[PDB]
From a paper:
The asymmetric unit of ΔMtDXPS contains a homodimer with each subunit consisting of three distinct domains and a ThDP molecule. Domain I (res 1–312) and Domain II (res 313–483) contribute to the active site, where ThDP is bound. Domain III (res 484–638) makes extensive contacts at the dimer interface. Overall, the structure and domain arrangement of MtDXPS show high similarity to the known structures of E. coli and D. radiodurans [name] that were described in detail by S. Xiang et al. with a Cα-RMSD of 1.390 and 1.207 Å, respectively. Three seemingly important differences, however, could be identified near the active site of MtDXPS: Lys473, His426 and Ser112. His426 is conserved in all bacterial [name] but adopts a different conformation in the MtDXPS structure. Unlike most bacteria, [name] has a serine at position 112 instead of a glycine or alanine. The serine at this position creates a steric restriction that prevents His426 from adopting its previously reported conformation, while at the same time enabling the coordination of a water molecule that stabilizes His426 in its new position. The water is highly coordinated, making hydrogen bonds with His426, Ser112, Tyr98 and other water molecules. This network extends to the aminopyrimidine N4’ and the backbone and side chains of Ser425.
1-Deoxy-d-xylulose 5-phosphate synthase ([name]) catalyzes the first reaction of the MEP pathway and is an attractive target for the development of new antibiotics. [name] catalyzes the ThDP-dependent decarboxylation of pyruvate and subsequent carboligation with d-glyceraldehyde-3-phosphate (D-GAP), the second substrate, following a preferred-order, random-sequential reaction mechanism. Here, we have applied our previously reported truncation approach and removed a disordered internal loop, to successfully crystallize the [name] from an important anti-infective target, namely [name]. Following the truncation approach, we were able to obtain protein crystals and report herein the first pathogenic [name] structures: a holo structure with bound ThDP and a structure containing the enamine reaction intermediate.
Author numbering:
A (entry chain BBB): 27 to 204, 223 to 278, 304 to 614
B (entry chain AAA): 28 to 204, 222 to 278, 304 to 614
The structure:
Amino acid sequence: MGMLQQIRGPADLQHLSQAQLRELAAEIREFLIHKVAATGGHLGPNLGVVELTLALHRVFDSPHDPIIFDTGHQAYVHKMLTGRSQDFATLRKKGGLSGYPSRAESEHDWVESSHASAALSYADGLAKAFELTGHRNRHVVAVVGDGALTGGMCWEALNNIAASRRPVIIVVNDNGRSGGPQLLFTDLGLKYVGPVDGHDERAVEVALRSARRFGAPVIVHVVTRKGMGYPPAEPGWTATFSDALIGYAQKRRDIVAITAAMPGPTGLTAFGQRFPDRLFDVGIAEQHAMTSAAGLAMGGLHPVVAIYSTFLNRAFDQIMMDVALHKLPVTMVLDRAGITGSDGASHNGMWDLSMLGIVPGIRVAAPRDATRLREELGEALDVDDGPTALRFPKGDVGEDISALERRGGVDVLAAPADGLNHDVLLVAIGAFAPMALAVAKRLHNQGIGVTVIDPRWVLPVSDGVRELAVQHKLLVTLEDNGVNGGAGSAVSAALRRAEIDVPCRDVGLPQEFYEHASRSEVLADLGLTDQDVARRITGWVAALG
Amino acid sequence: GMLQQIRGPADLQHLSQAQLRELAAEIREFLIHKVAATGGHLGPNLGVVELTLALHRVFDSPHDPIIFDTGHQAYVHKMLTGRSQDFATLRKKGGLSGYPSRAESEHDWVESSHASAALSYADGLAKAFELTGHRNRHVVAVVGDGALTGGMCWEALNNIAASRRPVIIVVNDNGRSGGGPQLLFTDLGLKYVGPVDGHDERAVEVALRSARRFGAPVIVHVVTRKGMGYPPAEPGWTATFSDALIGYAQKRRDIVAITAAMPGPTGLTAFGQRFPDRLFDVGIAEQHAMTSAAGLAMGGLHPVVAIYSTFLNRAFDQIMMDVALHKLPVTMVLDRAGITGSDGASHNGMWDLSMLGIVPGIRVAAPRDATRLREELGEALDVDDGPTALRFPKGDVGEDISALERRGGVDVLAAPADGLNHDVLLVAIGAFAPMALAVAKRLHNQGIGVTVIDPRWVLPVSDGVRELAVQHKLLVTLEDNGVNGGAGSAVSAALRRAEIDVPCRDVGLPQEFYEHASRSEVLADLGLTDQDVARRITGWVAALG
Ligand SMILES: Cc1ncc(C[n+]2csc(CCOP(=O)(O)OP(=O)(O)O)c2C)c(N)n1
Ligand SMILES: Cc1ncc(C[n+]2csc(CCOP(=O)(O)OP(=O)(O)O)c2C)c(N)n1
Ligand SMILES: [Mg+2]
Ligand SMILES: [Mg+2]
């Protein structure tokens, strides 16, 4: 990596020959292949933008010309050219290099959000700011994937950008042609340059220079190959969902599945292979996924919309006014619910119990294990008079956790030992059932008697939890979700509405954005461990009265 | 008297062009006579007389679904589907809805007033008809030029363009002879017909028949005149906001204002006249409004985004990942907060305190009166390290409500009379301060001592409300917002986090969609009156002593 080790920042590219840039691109690929996991590392999308990123830093003067990556998972080459190549040993590790652009890491980084299709909206705002503050000759460059370009925010932003001569350069990074828009963007009233071969570094520079000089908004359409230069790049909760859904759909022809551009990761690819007419991929279009789901339901079908928990924030108003307002039987399946960790603040699925709690009439399940995922999906598919949601975490599902009994839909997982009393009702939400059972055993050791329940259907709060609450002295909810408007607050609200003033505590994620770390590190750092939660509950029980 | 003879669409089928001219004139005089001058959408309905006649001359509703985007312009549709006699009750409790209603007519599909969704429903419905083998159902979406500036239209058109399934996109364009798209939609890869003279009933039928027989999706571009045939068509809270904002912006050149296509109704028109370079109208694009605000803030400005409470649902993920994640000083101003009444379930601003409570670090104010709106806006504009929001109702502002004292941010509006106990802390949110004071007077007469407080900054919950809560036997929050995740639930959560187990009660709007009625009728039907609330608090004070 002789030449790469000499690049201190973008201007070190400025007098390199085309032959030197060809050598450097080879070094960058070797570096990426060595430093980045071949699976789940975004190696492919980064290999795809080596020449594009060299060309951007040869034509634009960052950060005077902001270079804004849409989604930001493909910014590794950008970081390597902005003094951070030495930091890749720590990529996506706690206290290490972020997987996304980071304002704290570099003056060259603007947007930390992984949520796609936002770059052009930031670019419009920044271009307006530069005009209002009289900064001369700042060219805002948005790097927008073909996938990101299927998102409605890009249309809102392009409509606004097209109303002004303020220079926004729209660089379409298209690796969906040799997943992108069906619509043409050659004749929208915006100047269009290309298509450009995105692996011809000089061709990209020529196109970017024509865009820079045009003196008004311009689309530069560049075509890249995901994984360019590396042939390979060219029992899970998700697997349990995939198998369960196919099983239900074998018997019921009215079940259809919808993904916003993530058929593989949501486990819907296998569903499509069995029922290819019944799987819809709507692009990176969570809003359209939900409202087209409402349309399918108005036509007599029972859609299953699989969208990762964090991305469902985009569909809030569609869940409200298109699905819930019409009492339509849409099931939403939220994978990556709770802490995901390594992809940082904008990936953790920590909003969905708080957001869905606002929706009139909604029923929300949080599976504790594989059998409860299968069971709760079956129940969701039998709700024909309004929306349902299931939420479950990323990664492997542990062993089934058996109930001692079911009381009004509530699974009793543990009950106080004979000789101990009904001290604490521990309401274990979804994937925190193992933590709650460990807490109950630590409290048993202190002579504190704990009933652990899985409510299964967390919203609305069931008769089961009201009936058990009055038999205990303290209710503690334990949830892999933000505490503000979360399951704990919903349980307290339900008790108080029923004139039950048993003290309640809401144990979950503080209402904060978290830095990247492993799930176990994030939970350890917040004191969401059986040891720390048991110590807190010991303190609450001692303080009663 | 031809209109009296139209029992449904097929009664148009054998009318002469002269008869259609006469019927259009009767429809206009009917609309002018029956529809309220302000807030009745007379203009948009007068604009679609010939278009709606043409739709019901070419399409066979409901076999061919006719879906109105936003649905405020469906009055002619209702007059041609057996409901002309029902207009005496238009937008009255138990009367005709101002929007399409599935319960009123087999010809009505979508009840949501939230714009830009029609094409998403159309794609889903068209998919459903194919999956269920219904023959020859043409889904017609009537999409205003304004609605067409929304991102959902781009997502839907992208999906529709991938299939030959017959969706007919009727663009009802009254923005050209300017609230429609800047982008061209003549060359998107979809068949384009027009532009058509939208007041030439025959020419509109010719274009729609061309679309119906095409055998694939088609855009029909129809140009209409808003208020056609009525020259005139061709409040206090808001005015207080408008004046206050202009006053602050006089002294601070970094204040910018953003509207999603409602500069008049949000009170920003007057701001633009004073500061024309500092008002942005982004179209019907709440998502772009918030993320372009993030871009403006990243360029050193302090944006004020004025969006009606209910429509801010669309911007939830942008508030979260674009504004809040980057700790940017964007002030959101939510007019039409709380019950609005007459525009039905999809207009009531009853979600914002629950949705905004999810946002890490957010500060939310609810003005009780004009002076507190001025004060809290100034305080919002002085927050430089994260998002702020102000929410206030539709209509006229009453007299200022003076505080006895301010304690830890909190205004004490009433305290127990000398000789009464500190029985109830009544936490009056925003516009319910008058109701809270009336409740306190009634309970005073019963010998019940009430502290009424306006917390001013509802989120995060202030030291002031924790300090006063420990001094009372009962805490009751009274809020013009859904109870689920609302101010009352937040106050309870904050006390419990601080180890304060004073009984809390959440008095507000049940988490339900409300039928159209006046604001006073809705609040009376829910028991949100000083008489019914004082009665509930009497019952709680009795059970606690
Ligand atoms: C709102 C949202 N939904 C989904 C995703 C997940 N996502 C990341 S990349 C991608 C598909 C590819 O998009 P593109 O913009 O073409 O990027 P590239 O092909 O360069 O990886 C998706 C669905 C996201 N980041 N944001
Ligand atoms: C999401 C959303 N934002 C704002 C509005 C309020 N609204 C109603 S009509 C309109 C502007 C005009 O739109 P258009 O679709 O052109 O209808 P028309 O001109 O026929 O009234 C707006 C902003 C809304 N209904 N939905
Ligand atoms: Mg791509
Ligand atoms: Mg219009």
